Structures are given as structure tokens and as C-alpha cells.
Amino acid sequence: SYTLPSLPYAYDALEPHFDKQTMEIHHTKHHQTYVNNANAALESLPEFANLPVEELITKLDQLPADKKTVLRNNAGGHANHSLFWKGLKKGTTLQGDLKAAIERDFGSVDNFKAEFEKAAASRFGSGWAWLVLKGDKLAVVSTANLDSPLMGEAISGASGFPIMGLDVWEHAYYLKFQNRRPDYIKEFWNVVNWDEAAARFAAKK
Amino acid sequence: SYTLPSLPYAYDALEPHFDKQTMEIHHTKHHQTYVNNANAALESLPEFANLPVEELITKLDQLPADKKTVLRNNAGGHANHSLFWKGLKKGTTLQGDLKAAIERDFGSVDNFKAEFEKAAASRFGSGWAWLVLKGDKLAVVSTANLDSPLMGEAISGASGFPIMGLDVWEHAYYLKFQNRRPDYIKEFWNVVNWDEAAARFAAKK
Ligand SMILES: [Mn+2]
Ligand SMILES: [Mn+2]
């Protein structure tokens, strides 16, 4: 069974960029719900019930036709949010190999940020924006609802290993920024955990 | 060109059910954006710019490939929100032929409400829930993002003439209800404008 992961910091640890109220609701209400719904669906699927969530979402095609959608959405939600919490932290700095790769594939850090912001702002409806690693090159992509690049191109319309991502569902920014998603996107740069991003880039898997 | 319609009531006319702050943001920020984007796209299409928005969204397939998505989303947004504002009003009562038709196709008003709430609550991600008239029978359907049943089944996955609808994008309820969409759905029953719904049912088109 899946469980809500504990946060590696306090709910007000990302202030003054991401508000404490949202962090608490986002974690204890939204993420908790995905976990609860995924577990309920897996109760009748012993063969899949015990796989790590990141593995389950790479095998959605093997699931019974009547369970595929519920798990795609909720296991996807669990995987994405779990990655999100670990990918946030104040006071980090982009450096080393990751920075070099960024400048290499995007020309410069500023060009990268511009491309990421464009993808995050253009995602219509609910979705996520990602920095992925596809065949040794970094790229920016976005997915709908709670899909993940790990699900494959056929399902999510994207592929690649997620280095970092930004949740652009309205619940992630409405209390503090309301309709101003672009302002939320800019604040994100102050809390993106570059250390974790670097670690994932090094691992590659 | 489309004009942003003014609301048929003050921003606080739906209190204490729907909050004044959201009504103002929803109308002056979100709806305004859909109108702006739709007009920008229609600039080079004089032939389509003259049609009423409700008519334009039934002919999305006749638009040039590069204008189809932008207009589907934004013209859809304009059509849906325009209908939404007119469909809200306190103090109305479900009666007459509309009530009879509801009880006829759903067995009872309570059964209808249950079906509508289920559709509104189960829509994952951004979307709308609708009470539509297909031929001579009433039915409950839901669409993704800013699609409308008027767009046809091929595009939206649903069809029928909209009698009334509920916006379930998180911006419609997050400030007051946060994650509690079910509470928002319940409050809706207090502000659904049954007089307008009856009028649309009578016109049948
Ligand atoms: Mn989220
Ligand atoms: Mn809306």
C-alpha cells in the first residue's frame, strides 16, 4: 500500500515564495487523496499492489481496462507530488555538470528559464511542466492533468527521465497568486532544489 | 469581435453561496482573457468573426489547422462562461415543464441532483458538468477544459444543447472552498437560475 510521504521540511519552509497555507492543503488534502484513491483501486490487484509507484506508472498498459484510468490519474498524482516535495528547497544554486548541460542544450541558463516558463504558462487546463533527460539531452515538456513522462509517449504525449518539474494545476498557486500563474512561475526559481535536480541528473535512472 | 458581457447582477449578489472575490476575478480576469484570445485569433478570419460564439464552436472543423485549438479553447471559454453568468441567480424555483421533464428522464429531482453531482465531482482535472437536451431527452454529461457539448462528440466527447452547467475548474471555487469541490457543488443548487434554465429548455435551441 502507498502512504503519504512526510515532508523534508516544515510547511512554512518555502516562505516567502510558496505560501504555508497552500503547502499544507496541497500535501495533507490533495496528495493524501491520490494515495487513498490509488490504494482503493489496488486492493483488488495483488499483482500490482506491491510495486513502487514509479514502476506501476510505466506499466499502465498491463492493467485491467477498468482500472487503467483511475490508476493513471491517482498513481500519477502520487508519483508527481512525491517528486515535487523533494524538488523544493531554498538557498540552493545551479552549478556543476547540471549547469553545464543546461548551457549546452539551451545556450544559457536564461534561455532555459525562458523555455521552461513558456511551457509552464502555455499548458492549458491542469498539468505539469518538466525538465527531462532524453537520450543524453535535456528538454522541456509538459503533460496534462497528472500524467508523467515516465508513462510513455503513447499515454502522456511525452517521454524522458524527470529531473525536476512544476505543478501548474490551479490549486498549486491560486490562494496566493489567483490567476497570475506567471508570477507563480517566477517565484518557483527561488525554491527549486538544484541539489536534488543535480543528484537526479547524475543518476540518470 | 466578441464583447465581454457585463454580469446581470452585482459581484456580491450570490453571497453567501458564491464569494464576491471569486466572482470578480472569474469575470474580469479569466473570462476577459478568453475573449481577448478569441478576438486575436479571429482577426484574420472575417468570415468566422461575424458568427455568434455559440455558432462558431459548432464549426471548429472548418477553421484552418493552426486556429482550431486556440479557438476551441478560447471561444469555448467565452461561450461557457457567458452561459454560466446568466445561469446564476438566487431565489428561483424549479417548476413547470422543466421540472416535469427532469422527473420524467431522471425519475425525480433528487435523482437528477445525484447524477449531476456525481458527474461534477468525478471530472478529473479542469472541466464542466452539464444538463443537456439531446433530441427530446435530458441528460447529464461533462467535458474537459473549456470544451462544450455544442462542439460535438468527436471533439468534446459529448453532445446536446446546454440547458445549464457548472464550472469545475479550480479557479471557480478554490478561494472559498479550497479542495472541497463537493461543498461547492452543494452551494450551487442555491444559486442555479432555474428561470433561465426553463427559458433555454423552452427555446430548445
Ligand atoms: Mn498538485
Ligand atoms: Mn471558469
UniProtKB/Swiss-Prot annotation, chains A, B:
On cofactor binding, the record's note says:
Binds 1 Mn(2+) ion per subunit.
| Name of the molecule in the record | Superoxide dismutase [Mn]
Q: Which organism is it from?
A: Escherichia coli (strain K12)
Q: Where does Mn(2+) bind?
A: H26, H81, D167, H171
Reported cofactor(s)? Mn(2+)
Query: What class does this enzyme belong to in the EC scheme?
Result: oxidoreductase
Alphabetized Gene3D superfamilies for the sequence? Fe,Mn superoxide dismutase (SOD) domain, Iron/manganese superoxide dismutase, C-terminal domain
One of the Pfam families matching this protein, by short name: Sod_Fe_N
Q: What is the lineage of its organism?
A: Bacteria, Pseudomonadati, Pseudomonadota, Gammaproteobacteria, Enterobacterales
As its record notes, the protein acts as a catalyst of: 2 superoxide + 2 H(+) = H2O2 + O2
Task: Please describe what this protein does.
Answer: Destroys superoxide anion radicals which are normally produced within the cells and which are toxic to biological systems.
Q: Which UniProt keywords are listed?
A: Manganese, Metal-binding, Oxidoreductase
In short, the EC number is: 1.15.1.1
Family label: Belongs to the iron/manganese superoxide dismutase family.
Description of how the protein assembles with itself and partners: Homodimer.
**InterPro entries, alphabetically?**
Mn/Fe_SOD, Mn/Fe_SOD_BS, Mn/Fe_SOD_C, Mn/Fe_SOD_N, Mn/Fe_SOD_N_sf, SOD_C_sf
According to its UniProt entry, one GO biological process term is:
response to acidic pH
Q: Which is an annotated GO molecular function term of this record? A: metal ion binding
Q: Which domain of life is it from?
A: Bacteria
GO terms under cellular component: cytoplasm; cytosol
